[PDB]
Amino acid sequence: RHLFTSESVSEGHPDKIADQISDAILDAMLAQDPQARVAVETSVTTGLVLVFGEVSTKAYVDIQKVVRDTIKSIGYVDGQYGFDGDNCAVLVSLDEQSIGAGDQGMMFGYAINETPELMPLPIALSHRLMRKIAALRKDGTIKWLRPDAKAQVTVEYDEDNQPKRIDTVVLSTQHDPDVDLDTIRQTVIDQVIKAVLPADLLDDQTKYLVNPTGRFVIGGPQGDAGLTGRKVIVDTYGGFAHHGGGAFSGKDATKVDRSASYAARYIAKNVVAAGLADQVEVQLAYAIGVAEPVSIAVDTAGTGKVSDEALINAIRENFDLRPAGIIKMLDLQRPIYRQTAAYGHFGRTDIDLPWEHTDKVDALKAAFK
Amino acid sequence: RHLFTSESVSEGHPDKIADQISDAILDAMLAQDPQARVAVETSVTTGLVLVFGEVSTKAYVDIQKVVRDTIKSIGYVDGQYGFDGDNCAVLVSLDEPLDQIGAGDQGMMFGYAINETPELMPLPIALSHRLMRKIAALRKDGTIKWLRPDAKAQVTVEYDEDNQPKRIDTVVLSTQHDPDVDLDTIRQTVIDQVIKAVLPADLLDDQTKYLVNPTGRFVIGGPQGDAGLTGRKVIVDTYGGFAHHGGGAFSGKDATKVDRSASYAARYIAKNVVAAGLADQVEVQLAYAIGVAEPVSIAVDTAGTGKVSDEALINAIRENFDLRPAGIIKMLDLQRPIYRQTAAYGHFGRTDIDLPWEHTDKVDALKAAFK
Amino acid sequence: ERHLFTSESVSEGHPDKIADQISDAILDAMLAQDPQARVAVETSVTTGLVLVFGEVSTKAYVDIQKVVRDTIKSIGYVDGQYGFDGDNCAVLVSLDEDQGMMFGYAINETPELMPLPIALSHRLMRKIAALRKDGTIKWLRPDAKAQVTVEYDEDNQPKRIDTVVLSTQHDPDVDLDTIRQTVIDQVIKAVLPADLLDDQTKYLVNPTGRFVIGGPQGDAGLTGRKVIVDTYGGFAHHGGGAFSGKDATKVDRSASYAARYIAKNVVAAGLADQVEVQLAYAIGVAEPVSIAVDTAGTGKVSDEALINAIRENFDLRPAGIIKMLDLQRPIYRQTAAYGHFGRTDIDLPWEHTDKVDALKAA
Amino acid sequence: ERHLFTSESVSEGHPDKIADQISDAILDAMLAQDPQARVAVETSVTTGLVLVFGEVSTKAYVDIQKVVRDTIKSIGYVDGQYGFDGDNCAVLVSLDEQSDQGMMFGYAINETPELMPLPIALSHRLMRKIAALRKDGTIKWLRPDAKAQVTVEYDEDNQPKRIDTVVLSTQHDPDVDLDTIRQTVIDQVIKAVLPADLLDDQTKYLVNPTGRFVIGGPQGDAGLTGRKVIVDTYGGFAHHGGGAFSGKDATKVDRSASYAARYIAKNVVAAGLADQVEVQLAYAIGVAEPVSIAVDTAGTGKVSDEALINAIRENFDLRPAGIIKMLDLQRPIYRQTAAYGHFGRTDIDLPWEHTDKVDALKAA
Ligand SMILES: Nc1ncnc2c1ncn2[C@@H]1O[C@H](COP(=O)(O)OP(=O)(O)NP(=O)(O)O)[C@@H](O)[C@H]1O
Ligand SMILES: Nc1ncnc2c1ncn2[C@@H]1O[C@H](COP(=O)(O)OP(=O)(O)NP(=O)(O)O)[C@@H](O)[C@H]1O
Ligand SMILES: [K+]
Ligand SMILES: [K+]
Ligand SMILES: [K+]
Ligand SMILES: [Mg+2]
Ligand SMILES: [Mg+2]
Ligand SMILES: [Mg+2]
Ligand SMILES: [Mg+2]
Ligand SMILES: [Mg+2]
Ligand SMILES: [Mg+2]
Ligand SMILES: [Mg+2]
Ligand SMILES: [Mg+2]
């Protein structure tokens, strides 16, 4: 029985709090200094936010205000949650310091026509569940919802490895303590899960598990811990793709780890959007102090409507893949990163990310003329 | 040109300092309480070690002593380096059949093995690990007294049309050193006593690029200029990006965490399959459901190197491995202090230490399943 | 020119007192299992944070996190609406493994033989706290402060009470007029002696106004930054140690307790109306090398003769003081708020007047 | 019975003084750009750690990390030798952004030219000398952390009769034996600073009686802002309202009125209106002027107490705002006070140590 599970987490999850803080600080600095170099880790545990890293910028930023404001947007805005943007400890250890690649790295991109956003079905549905739960909290539709939430979607795959059905949805949400489990369960199933899962993939055997922990009143960093870059699979493709092993949040586009991974997605997505494959993993190899990627591999899983060598050729001709090139190409020296630090860097329908534009379709179509 | 790069890092790298501390605390507790539940993150920056997490144990452990002792073994001792086990800040924020123990995460875990190396690991990650382990051994036995703990290796292997390892294209190796040694000496010494001591001669040619400390001088390192966190070397810890990920991290977690135990089990499978000659390579894929001991689903990718059916191989695995969380713990004897040693130079492919999930003692069981 | 003198006291809830009580709660925890425990434990508290740091040497097993969080809960920080909570705040722990002057003071201004300003300040903070904790006033929150200005006559006798300033943390659902009338009636008028009050006595309750979030939230607190509050409200001189976080091995603490024990017994015996006792220790000499005494000419006896009675009736060696006052017991958390001296509400050995007959007889 | 009195001072290197200097270095940094800067900055220091925390409200842009690490380097913790280092130690920062019915006491006494009690003054002079000798490189084996305790013997009339005991403990490189440490401190520090006319063959000199002392600063110990208040003031000769100075801008009457109280005491005694005086200021909530001024001359008054209080009300602006203008306190002048005493300073120029109100008081 071919079953595959992917997870996503809300803005409220401690690991995502860390990622959003790291990227909020990045935005704050790019907002004043497009040239800002940034390398900012965040750690969060019971009542604590430690920010630490190197930075090099002309920008003047009140880190405390950025951290506390980020935590408030997420929804931690009164002490009944245990965690509060105004009342939590914030400790800061920042150093201040004011082409060609710096890492001998591998970066991977992926796309697949399983969903309109060209993402695998499990990660895409997980993301849509966390984004819906969050929207329902924030617009005030469900007043008892608290920030921290998690979804795991198990999809059952065919003989052809096509998505046959949805086997299990696990969804856990933080809530006000004045709401009983039966209400939380019925409400999530009805207004979150059944609002987002396509009806044609559900049957009477689909398992819906809401808050299997039971009550979940105190959350965020309170019982738990959270760190920058511990939701890499959530951040990318839910484990459909390979990894060079950087993490994104807290890093400016100077970091090819981040910029080439965005570029790799841009390629994969345009290839599949153009119909040149049903799925493709793009593999970029950089050498230290060589701008151009030293090597480009491509895996279509034999869904390629074109040669592998011919596809690699189209990509070398229509994408600038030098670190500097990618920055100009995707316009990455702008404060666009806080919004990526929850609900996935890839497959985003709710916000406009440059590497999700399908504006290289005509360029690629034309390359076979 | 089909090129593929993997990195490994020394005990001295800040991310690995974090991983070793988290797992040193785990060992300390298992050493007194095999039943110890542990979830311990570590963060390290300039002169600082923050330890934080949940724990539940009958053990009495001096966390400060464990952290400072771990940092000293790594080699940060007697105040030379700017990071020191005796002199650094340490802050601690700690909270306080075999069927019916089912899984807690609705997770995916992956295992991998490939006959590219005797340890049955991909060539890039394996060589990277061997370089960091050699540099470390040479420091610690005192063969090269000017070496400092923090070091990094990136090995680029060139693959032919059939994706077989053709040659070694580039080795990048950066090491921390005493400031009284010039770059030319560092470079010639690393090339001769580390790289040429470890890279198989038959994969080297006059076009192999050796870049040692391409940044230049590297005197202050560890957490000093940098930052390090538990579970930010997951690719280093596993298969150098040859395999897929459910997205746990290992260090700081007791074997109660199926994220860790099933990943160990998945390697044990993959390695025994390939060791038995039932494939040249296999990725093993385990799917667990919340509160179901048995994996709900097992997939297997041989890349058409399978000497046996996929359905028949999955069958042999279900018959010869206990894959219940509790089962894996008994099977691999995981309630022992065996984890500090995994937190640098890879969890997989280890020839220098004895890890249960690296034993090839299920070969005859699997061979026998096809006669 | 009006001879006015002001002293302040602060509640368990004040951030500096939170620090002092945590440091001393950890000390008690260890003495409770190991009377020989050596302890030197500083605490710092700011927005949502408690850093504990210091040296310790003990056979005791103590969960520091549990001690810190339990201390903070007793103080009354027990739900997140206060901003500060024993369950939800950050707790960081950094625990490793004198040629001095000390001063004592006593004065017959109050039955406890303390200066009137510090004594009244302490009684106000102790009453406000009792009223919160027994649930008499449900809208009170932990953090509170009192400043009592006493007017002194010619002869420097307490003539009247000029001003009482009292500021308390409260639930936000209670109006200022209610807070003021309630504190005046159930705290101030319950504690200030009527014979020292007149129609000119100024009562200022929460002159800042509303005060809903407090403790370490807006502020900062450190171990040993309420030394004047802890002692005699500025009537006395200081060698300049602080008490909380230190076992009785620290002569800074033990000799200061001993100095009070002397002063109090001298004045209780009627040998003076007031006395400051001054103890000088030399490094590696058990006995104090020198004892001075200032009666402010209220001495019923010679200074040299009084010093003589003290040398004859008190063991003043560090070891001696520990045995004499039985100081290797967990009795210190109690002292870390509402004053080390003049305590009628708890039993401290250095407040016993059991050496009166010994000094009368001399 | 022998009337003996001991005061201590500590070096820049002592952990409590490291905390005080960091808190005041941050204050200076902000006043340097914003004279109007409101500041309330605590520092804590333990093994390899500096936590900075407090409220602040300023137009100034300050790299706190750079200020902390630079302060620690001046103190002498500079090249990874000592186990505490300005470049290698942890620095954590928790600063919030916002852009008293008190007693304060002053004291002066003609026991020393600076008009300070002899014990605290001599203690300060020993720590300042030990520090100068380290920093100018005269004694290369000295390390930052050091402590002095001076016991003075007093007469029946409480006049300084002699110096009974000097205790001085210094941190040192481990390659130097105790006999060298002792002879060097006695010769180049103690005998360089103690007035010969107060020494006799009974004067006890104890140098490093503890023994070896190679690791110090915050390493084995802990240090906090405002735990050297007696050292910072008058060595226990005076009374205390119970503020601490370092980390606080002059907006804090705790600090500004204490400076003002010293300014008064010193000018009174400098004018010869008394041999010693303790000045006592009482402030009431919402009254700029001190509500009450007491004065204790210990019967050394050459004038009435009521007449002296009158001269003080007529010649000093004692309103919080008044004191700031009077002593020009909205300037970066505070880092220098955070070691070797706020009062009696001969080596630096502090406004509250000027004796420029003598003629005003003489004339009254
Ligand atoms: N001047 C230098 N020259 C060379 N190497 C250095 C220098 N300074 C630091 N390093 C090393 O480079 C490391 C950073 O590499 P890396 O492993 O990428 O860091 P990371 O903090 O784990 N981030 P990332 O891999 O991008 O997700 C440091 O931890 C040191 O090991
Ligand atoms: N004490 C708790 N009570 C209730 N729910 C909790 C508690 N602790 C954790 N959780 C929930 O479980 C989540 C942690 O699970 P997970 O997403 O695996 O995070 P992680 O362990 O921080 N990261 P990783 O190891 O990289 O997979 C929390 O964010 C909550 O959703
Ligand atoms: K966690
Ligand atoms: K880093
Ligand atoms: K101290
Ligand atoms: Mg985590
Ligand atoms: Mg990287
Ligand atoms: Mg890192
Ligand atoms: Mg998980
Ligand atoms: Mg304070
Ligand atoms: Mg002292
Ligand atoms: Mg101390
Ligand atoms: Mg005050």
Residue numbers in the entry:
A (entry chain D): 4 to 101, 125 to 395
B (entry chain C): 4 to 99, 121 to 395
C (entry chain B): 3 to 99, 129 to 393
D (entry chain A): 3 to 101, 129 to 393
What's the publication's text?
MATs are an essential and ubiquitous enzyme family found in all domains of life. 38 MATs catalyze the condensation of ATP with methionine to generate S‐adenosylmethionine (SAM)—an essential molecule involved in numerous biological processes, including RNA, DNA, protein and small molecule methylation, polyamine synthesis, and production of enzyme cofactors. 39 Analysis of available crystal structures reveals that bacterial MATs are predominantly dihedral homotetramers (D2 symmetry group), that is, comprised of dimers of dimers 40. Two deep cavities harboring active sites are located directly in this dimeric interface, making the homodimer the obligatory functional unit.
To enrich the structural dataset, we determined the crystal structure of MAT from Lactiplantibacillus planatrum at 2.82 Å resolution, making it the only current MAT representative of the Bacillota phylum, and added this structure to analysis. We also found that MAT from Lactiplantibacillus plantarum (LpMAT) does not require chaperonins for folding and activity. Similarly to NgMAT, LpMAT assumes a predominantly dimeric state in solution, its interdimeric interface lacks salt‐bridges, and is less hydrophobic than EcMAT. Since MATs from N. gonorrhoeae and L. plantarum fold and assemble in the absence of chaperonins, the folding dependency of EcMAT is not a general inherent property of the MAT fold.
